[PDB]
């Protein structure tokens, strides 16, 4: 969730 | 190619006691994502595998960071928030056992051998590239990345510290202690959440939640 | 001197699914004591340290044994009692998760690399000589014994398998998985005891009891 | 206990 948004950019 | 120079750049680029520990942990999770992006070839992995690796090693990755950061501290931990947690304060908070394990098994061992930041980065990259992580779309690819990490680390140790032939094996033999300490710290995290007495922030909460 | 030849002699000298697993574990604890006596210099340690080392590593020591013993088995474990436990039987008993971890992270990894009995003995001696064990009268002495173990192991790997330079690091990098699997297996042991449904024999019971 | 007796002989 938050990890996904941070791994994108 | 897995150059230790870039792994070092990643380490240098990211540079109530229980409540303060959780705050620092949540703050470093955001930094941990930036660090992993700087490890060669990590961003080239499938997004779902990147998530699996970080969710599986975020705890050991943070513990290895603040331990090495505290090698100069006397019987204490230096949190990423700038607060010094002394073993007496940790013992007075009820987490003295695991706190002592971190000092004896990690901080002190790092201090005695003068583990440099390049070796710390290599170890954190090794735990990052955990081929045993469940759900990996291609564990072999992750294992190949791990093999290139400890392949470059060994060559770096034999060149930087040629008079310490066993330094390479000594570095890897701290990972078992890192593994067990991470599991114990995670149990405390669940008890903190379950007891509801401790503030758990968003990112740290997300790590406490199931896949 | 820590000759791998003698370490090999030690390994060769000792050669309801849940209930059958506990029976085998209790039976091997007695054998584990005999094995440790054959590891060079272990019997020369203080009796209290010998007790600390075995109580601290008995579980990982047994798990490493039956895992390597099962490399030839297909999706199953070969207990020291001669009984074959298949992953389906283990899953039908409610212990399928940890049983799968043993297969993927230990047995299969051992089978893929053809880990020989000399390397298994060296790894079991490394876990035996755990300088992090709490209460050791002289942890440095135990660490010196561990250093001589993985010093002889590296030389053995570079001579036996000269075309596999990373085999030594690969061997040590299974210990983290061994550490976490041992902790999980131990939790199951406590739940078995706590639930009182499973027979726990004397020696295994003694390991479940506090220091 | 049992371990001690086995470590003796
Ligand atoms: C010395 C041991 C005490 C202790 C106990 C519980 C803990 O976890 C609970 C929260 C995850 C931790 C902890 C701190 C950090 C902070 C790191 C940083 O500031 O850089 C990260 C992960 C941790 O598991 C430390
Ligand atoms: C595959 C995993 C299932 C499983 C689950 C719980 C277990 O522990 C519970 C009892 C300690 C064990 C286990 C078996 C043995 C038997 C060894 C042998 O026969 O040589 C030893 C230690 C163990 O922890 C295995």
Atom of ligand 1 nearest to the CA of B65: 20
Are B99 and B87 contacting, i.e. CB atoms less than 8 angstroms apart? yes
Cβ neighbours of residue B71 under 8 Å, at least 6 residues apart? B107, B110, B111, B115
For ligand 2, the distance from its centroid to the CA atom of residue C33, given in whole angstroms, is 17
Minimal CA separation from D6 to chain C, in Å: 7
Joined tokens for residue C18? 């849940």
Q: Point out the residue among D1, D2, D7 whose CB comes nearest to the CB of C50.
A: D7
CB-CB neighbours of B156 under 10 Å: 21
C68-77: long-range pairs with CB below 8 Å, 24+: C68/C107, C68/C110, C68/C115, C68/C117, C68/C120, C70/C107, C71/C107, C71/C110, C71/C111, C71/C115, C72/C111, C73/C107, C75/C103, C77/C102, C77/C103, C77/C107
Experimental technique behind these coordinates: X-ray
Which residues of B lie inside 8 Å of A (Cβ-Cβ)? 30, 33, 37, 47, 50-51, 54-55, 202-203, 206
Q: Using CA atoms, how far apart are residues B159 and B168, in angstroms rounded to an integer?
A: 11
Helix (H) or strand (E) run with residue A6 in it: helix A2-8
Q: Using CA atoms, how far apart are residues B3 and C74, in angstroms rounded to an integer?
A: 39
Local structure of C33: helix, strand or coil? helix
A9 interface with B at CB cutoff 8 Å: no
Q: Using CA atoms, how far apart are residues A4 and C88, in angstroms rounded to an integer?
A: 35
Cβ neighbours of residue C82 under 8 Å, at least 6 residues apart? none
Q: Count the helix, strand and coil residues of chain D and give each as a percent rounded to the nearest 5.
A: 80, 0, 20
CB-CB neighbours of B5 under 10 Å: 9
Which residues of C lie inside 8 Å of D (Cβ-Cβ)? 30, 33, 37, 47, 50-51, 54-55, 202-203, 206
Tokens 């601290």 locate to C56
The closest of C80, C75, C70 to C90, measured between CA atoms, is C75
The closest of C2, C7, C25, C15 to C199, measured between CA atoms, is C25
Apex C83 CA angle, C122 and C177, nearest 5: 40
| Separation of first and last alpha carbons in chain B | 32
D9 interface with C at CB cutoff 8 Å: no
Local structure of C84: helix, strand or coil? strand
Q: Return the number of CB contacts < 8 Å for B and C.
A: 51
Are B189 and B29 contacting, i.e. CB atoms less than 8 angstroms apart? no
- The residue contributing the CA closest to ligand 2 atom 17 is C25
Enter the DSSP assignment of B75.
Answer: S
Local structure of B71: helix, strand or coil? coil
CB-CB neighbours of C82 under 10 Å: 7
Cβ neighbours of residue B205 under 8 Å, at least 6 residues apart? B193
Our answer on whether the CB atom of C175 is closer than 6 Å to any ligand 2 atom is: no
Chain A residues near residue B206 by CB distance under 8 angstroms: 1-3
B140 annotated to a ligand binding site: no
CB-CB neighbours of B145 under 10 Å: 22
CB-CB neighbours of B141 under 10 Å: 17
Local structure of C88: helix, strand or coil? helix
Minimal CA separation from B180 to chain C, in Å: 6
Tokens 């070839």 locate to B41
Sign of CA dihedral B142, C113, C56, C24: positive
| Fold classified for B1-211 | Retinoid X Receptor (1.10.565)
DSSP per-residue letters across B105-134: IIIHHHHHHT--HHHHHHHHHHHHS-TT-T
Residue C178 half-sphere exposure, CB side, CA atoms within 13 Å? 29
Joined tokens for residue B10? 């990643």
Burial B69-98 (b: 16+ CB within 10 A, else e): bbbebeebbbbbeeeebebebbeebebeee
Q: Return the number of CB contacts < 8 Å for A and B.
A: 20
Apex C178 CA angle, C177 and C181, nearest 5: 85
Our answer on whether the CB atom of B120 is closer than 6 Å to any ligand 1 atom is: no
Instruction: Pinpoint the alpha helices (H) of chain B.
Output: 4-13, 17-38, 47-69, 87-92, 96-102, 108-113, 117-128, 139-160, 167-172, 175-195, 202-208
Our answer on whether the CB atom of B103 is closer than 6 Å to any ligand 1 atom is: no
CB D6 to CB C30 under 8 A? yes
Apex B80 CA angle, B77 and B86, nearest 5: 20
For ligand 2, the distance from its centroid to the CA atom of residue C15, given in whole angstroms, is 17
A5 interface with B at CB cutoff 8 Å: no
How many angstroms is the resolution? 2.5
B80 annotated to a ligand binding site: yes
Are C91 and C143 contacting, i.e. CB atoms less than 8 angstroms apart? no
């Amino acid at each position: 969730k938050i990890l996904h948004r941070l791994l994108q950019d | 190619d897995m150059p230790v120079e870039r792994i070092l750049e990643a380490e240098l680029a990211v540079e109530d006691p229980v409540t303060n520990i959780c705050q620092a942990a949540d703050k470093q999770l955001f930094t941990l994502v930036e660090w992993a992006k700087r490890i060669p070839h990590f961003s080239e992995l499938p997004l779902d595998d990147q998530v699996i690796l970080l969710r599986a090693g975020w705890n050991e990755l943070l513990i290895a960071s603040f331990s090495h950061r505290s090698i100069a501290v006397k019987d204490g931990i230096l949190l990423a928030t700038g607060l010094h947690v002394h073993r007496n304060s940790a013992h007075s908070a009820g987490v003295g056992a695991i706190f002592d394990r971190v000092l004896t098994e990690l901080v002190s061992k790092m201090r005695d051998m003068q583990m440099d930041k390049t070796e710390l980065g290599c170890l954190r990259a090794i735990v990052l590239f955990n081929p045993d992580s469940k759900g990996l779309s291609n564990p072999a690819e992750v294992e190949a990345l791990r093999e290139k990490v400890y392949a470059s680390l060994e060559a770096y140790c034999k060149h930087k510290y040629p008079e310490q032939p066993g330094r390479f094996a000594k570095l890897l033999l701290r990972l078992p202690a890192l593994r067990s300490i991470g599991l114990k710290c995670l149990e405390h995290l669940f008890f903190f959440k379950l007891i509801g007495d401790t503030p758990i922030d968003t990112f740290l909460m997300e790590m406490l939640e199931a896949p």
